[PDB]
Each structure stands twice: as structure tokens, then as C-alpha cells.
Amino acid sequence: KVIYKGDTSKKQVAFTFDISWGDKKAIPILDTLKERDIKNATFFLSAAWAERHPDVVERIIKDGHEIGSMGYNYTSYTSLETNEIRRDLLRAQDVFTKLGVKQIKLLRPPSGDFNKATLKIAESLGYTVVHWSNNSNDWKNPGVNKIVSTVSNNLKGGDIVLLHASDSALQTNKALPLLLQKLKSDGYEQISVSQLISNT
């Protein structure tokens, strides 16, 4: 009931960007996506961050991208009671609505940590939990070439690719045109995570 990937027999993939902190890297990444004509990437946002940087959220919404939740506080759901998790998710949705975000259907739990409890809660709140199938490791800043080869050497149809647009991502923007070119030249289509889910 978590989604790791979409239809493996079709040439559609989802680039996803997590943002848990920062005020410098997301906007240039957004400028790059616009310049390369991508209007349907997916961004998972910590709502504590979003509340502090509504200008960045505004830009994500304006350019057309899908937004998913990463809760409010950036602490692991596996280390929390049931009610604490529900409350974090509710606080987050409250913030997202005030920022004008279309109602959240998608959840990426902080740090990617979840268990059985988390999933049922998420289901109780109407959320689909989203993981990934292709980790760029861009948060490690291993070099542009390494980000590009990690994603592209392993690229399969249906992939959900993990990238970051937080201020930890020093090289993601530099890698992004090369990633998008690889997609186009090899006949893959970049779609949002919701588009990918419905296309399964």
C-alpha cells in the first residue's frame, strides 16, 4: 500500500524532490525545470519549512508541480505514538491549505522511516505513502557525473527517482539538465507521482 514505482512496462518516470530545509537551492532548481519545460515534477515538503518559506512554495505551485507532504516536524514517525503522528499530519495539512496547496493525497514520511502503524494512520487520513525505486544519492553530493550516472545507469520505466531541493543539494541543479536530457533522448516521459499512480 506504499508505492515504490509505477508501471514497469511503460516509459514514464517521476522525478521527485524532497525539501526539509533551506533558502537557496530550490529556486534555481525551479528555474531549471521551467527552462527545460518541465511543469509536472513532484515536490515533497516539510510543512515546518514551508511555513517559513512560503515564497518558495508559491513558486512551486505557480509553475504547476505536484506537492506532497513530509509531515510538519522533521522527526521520524517510527519514534512516535499514533496520536502524535496523526497530529503532525493534520498540522501539516493545515499549513499547506493556508499556503494554497491543493489538498494533499501523497505522503513521504520524514527520513523515509515508516512501519505498519504509520501506513494505517496515513490510510486513515486519506494519504498514499510514497517511497522511491531509484535513489540519486544527490544529498551526498558525490559529484555531478555520479548523480547523473546513478540515475541513468539504473533508469527503468515506472521509476520514482529521489532527488533533493533542500540546501543540502549542492549539485542537483547542475545534474538536472543532464538527467532531463537522458530522459527525453531515451524516450521516457517525466510525469507527476499522482499521474504515475493512476497510470498503473
C-alpha positions as a printed NumPy array, in Angstrom:
array([[  0.   ,   0.   ,   0.   ],
       [  3.156,   2.09 ,  -0.183],
       [  4.217,   2.931,  -3.739],
       [  7.85 ,   2.422,  -4.78 ],
       [  7.302,   2.648,  -8.526],
       [  4.747,   2.697, -11.321],
       [  4.043,   0.615, -14.419],
       [  7.349,  -1.051, -15.342],
       [  6.136,  -1.835, -18.859],
       [  5.736,   1.82 , -19.84 ],
       [  8.295,   4.58 , -20.386],
       [  7.146,   7.047, -17.744],
       [  9.09 ,   8.041, -14.64 ],
       [  8.594,  10.528, -11.826],
       [ 11.31 ,  12.904, -10.649],
       [ 10.645,  13.794,  -7.025],
       [ 12.364,  16.457,  -4.905],
       [ 12.347,  16.468,  -1.088],
       [ 12.776,  19.805,   0.727],
       [ 13.234,  19.722,   4.515],
       [ 15.244,  22.933,   4.919],
       [ 16.93 ,  25.78 ,   3.113],
       [ 16.502,  29.071,   1.269],
       [ 18.989,  28.905,  -1.648],
       [ 18.84 ,  25.773,  -3.837],
       [ 15.13 ,  25.242,  -4.579],
       [ 14.564,  28.378,  -6.667],
       [ 17.409,  27.69 ,  -9.14 ],
       [ 16.171,  24.079,  -9.433],
       [ 12.723,  25.505, -10.191],
       [ 14.217,  27.874, -12.785],
       [ 15.951,  24.923, -14.436],
       [ 12.736,  22.849, -14.609],
       [ 10.906,  25.795, -16.167],
       [ 13.699,  26.387, -18.696],
       [ 13.705,  22.715, -19.729],
       [  9.882,  22.795, -19.988],
       [  9.056,  20.536, -17.017],
       [  5.828,  21.587, -15.241],
       [  4.854,  18.344, -13.528],
       [  7.635,  17.26 , -11.206],
       [  6.685,  16.308,  -7.642],
       [  7.964,  18.096,  -4.513],
       [  7.631,  16.662,  -1.014],
       [  7.751,  19.449,   1.545],
       [  8.217,  19.581,   5.275],
       [  5.415,  21.895,   6.424],
       [  7.593,  23.465,   9.122],
       [  9.917,  24.512,   6.332],
       [  7.022,  25.613,   4.076],
       [  5.541,  27.848,   6.77 ],
       [  8.909,  29.68 ,   6.944],
       [  9.46 ,  29.844,   3.168],
       [  6.068,  30.494,   1.554],
       [  7.732,  32.374,  -1.299],
       [  9.33 ,  29.123,  -2.434],
       [  6.084,  27.159,  -2.03 ],
       [  4.303,  29.888,  -4.054],
       [  6.763,  29.349,  -6.888],
       [  6.322,  25.558,  -6.89 ],
       [  2.541,  25.984,  -7.101],
       [  2.78 ,  28.666,  -9.798],
       [  4.938,  26.524, -12.082],
       [  2.478,  23.632, -11.957],
       [  4.281,  20.98 ,  -9.925],
       [  2.588,  18.469,  -7.653],
       [  3.164,  18.901,  -3.887],
       [  3.259,  16.111,  -1.346],
       [  3.559,  16.249,   2.426],
       [  6.555,  15.258,   4.583],
       [  4.686,  15.985,   7.815],
       [  5.222,  19.145,   9.855],
       [  8.085,  18.388,  12.211],
       [ 11.063,  16.662,  10.611],
       [ 11.194,  13.77 ,  13.08 ],
       [ 10.723,  10.071,  12.311],
       [  7.189,   8.665,  12.578],
       [  8.591,   5.311,  13.804],
       [  9.639,   7.071,  17.004],
       [  6.171,   8.492,  17.752],
       [  2.831,   7.44 ,  19.244],
       [ -0.201,   7.049,  16.95 ],
       [ -1.865,  10.313,  18.015],
       [  1.399,  12.253,  17.664],
       [  1.661,  11.126,  14.03 ],
       [ -1.967,  11.992,  13.214],
       [ -1.472,  15.434,  14.783],
       [  1.743,  16.092,  12.83 ],
       [ -0.033,  15.217,   9.595],
       [ -3.039,  17.405,  10.473],
       [ -0.839,  20.372,  11.408],
       [  0.958,  19.916,   8.09 ],
       [ -2.262,  19.844,   6.011],
       [ -3.395,  22.97 ,   7.843],
       [ -0.239,  24.814,   6.782],
       [ -0.438,  23.533,   3.219],
       [ -4.016,  24.771,   2.835],
       [ -3.057,  28.202,   4.15 ],
       [ -0.292,  28.251,   1.531],
       [ -2.875,  27.466,  -1.16 ],
       [ -1.655,  23.94 ,  -1.883],
       [ -4.191,  21.602,  -3.498],
       [ -5.209,  19.063,  -0.859],
       [ -2.52 ,  16.506,  -0.115],
       [ -3.007,  12.958,  -1.373],
       [  0.657,  11.932,  -1.087],
       [  2.931,  11.412,   1.898],
       [  6.661,  10.859,   2.198],
       [  7.287,  10.266,   5.934],
       [ 10.262,  12.19 ,   7.397],
       [ 13.547,  10.321,   6.651],
       [ 11.555,   7.658,   4.787],
       [ 11.02 ,   5.818,   8.075],
       [  7.64 ,   4.123,   8.454],
       [  6.082,   0.873,   9.682],
       [  2.642,  -0.751,   9.93 ],
       [  1.239,   1.866,  12.298],
       [  2.277,   4.742,  10.037],
       [  0.617,   3.243,   6.944],
       [ -2.756,   2.692,   8.612],
       [ -2.704,   6.217,  10.01 ],
       [ -1.812,   7.543,   6.568],
       [ -4.668,   5.49 ,   5.123],
       [ -6.973,   6.813,   7.858],
       [ -6.106,  10.344,   6.712],
       [ -6.616,   9.511,   3.033],
       [ -2.903,   9.515,   2.136],
       [ -0.876,   7.256,  -0.132],
       [  2.645,   6.664,   1.209],
       [  5.294,   7.271,  -1.483],
       [  8.812,   5.856,  -1.382],
       [ 11.172,   5.553,  -4.374],
       [ 12.856,   2.997,  -6.618],
       [ 15.868,   4.965,  -7.893],
       [ 17.953,   6.931,  -5.376],
       [ 20.211,   9.576,  -6.972],
       [ 22.141,   9.926,  -3.69 ],
       [ 22.353,  13.625,  -4.538],
       [ 22.2  ,  14.562,  -0.812],
       [ 25.697,  13.05 ,  -0.539],
       [ 26.961,  15.48 ,  -3.197],
       [ 29.047,  12.736,  -4.844],
       [ 29.75 ,  14.824,  -7.949],
       [ 27.518,  15.77 , -10.897],
       [ 28.728,  12.856, -13.052],
       [ 27.946,  10.419, -10.241],
       [ 24.424,  11.798,  -9.714],
       [ 23.804,  11.57 , -13.448],
       [ 25.205,   8.034, -13.833],
       [ 23.481,   6.68 , -10.712],
       [ 20.054,   7.709, -12.002],
       [ 20.625,   6.999, -15.666],
       [ 22.508,   3.648, -15.386],
       [ 19.648,   2.291, -13.281],
       [ 16.768,   4.009, -15.054],
       [ 13.721,   1.769, -15.616],
       [ 10.213,   2.623, -16.785],
       [  7.984,   3.306, -13.787],
       [ 10.875,   4.637, -11.678],
       [ 10.278,   7.093,  -8.888],
       [ 13.555,   8.984,  -8.612],
       [ 14.676,  10.553,  -5.337],
       [ 16.374,  13.945,  -5.659],
       [ 16.621,  16.837,  -3.199],
       [ 15.943,  20.565,  -3.491],
       [ 16.978,  21.408,   0.075],
       [ 20.161,  23.396,   0.736],
       [ 21.976,  20.048,   1.188],
       [ 21.695,  19.627,  -2.584],
       [ 24.757,  21.476,  -3.863],
       [ 24.968,  19.639,  -7.205],
       [ 21.375,  18.694,  -8.075],
       [ 20.688,  21.752, -10.246],
       [ 23.897,  21.127, -12.249],
       [ 22.916,  17.487, -12.817],
       [ 19.302,  18.263, -13.699],
       [ 19.639,  19.28 , -17.369],
       [ 21.669,  16.121, -17.985],
       [ 19.085,  13.955, -16.222],
       [ 16.24 ,  15.552, -18.205],
       [ 18.139,  15.1  , -21.482],
       [ 18.756,  11.436, -20.717],
       [ 15.007,  11.073, -20.154],
       [ 13.965,  12.74 , -23.405],
       [ 16.669,  11.196, -25.625],
       [ 15.827,   7.678, -24.45 ],
       [ 12.073,   8.136, -24.885],
       [ 10.997,   8.406, -21.252],
       [  8.274,  10.813, -20.157],
       [  8.508,  12.664, -16.823],
       [  5.138,  12.676, -15.035],
       [  3.939,  13.604, -11.553],
       [  3.626,  10.907,  -8.866],
       [ -0.185,  11.124,  -8.977],
       [ -0.122,  10.749, -12.757],
       [  2.178,   7.73 , -12.331],
       [ -0.064,   6.112,  -9.718],
       [ -3.193,   6.495, -11.843],
       [ -1.285,   5.129, -14.861],
       [ -0.587,   1.783, -13.181]])
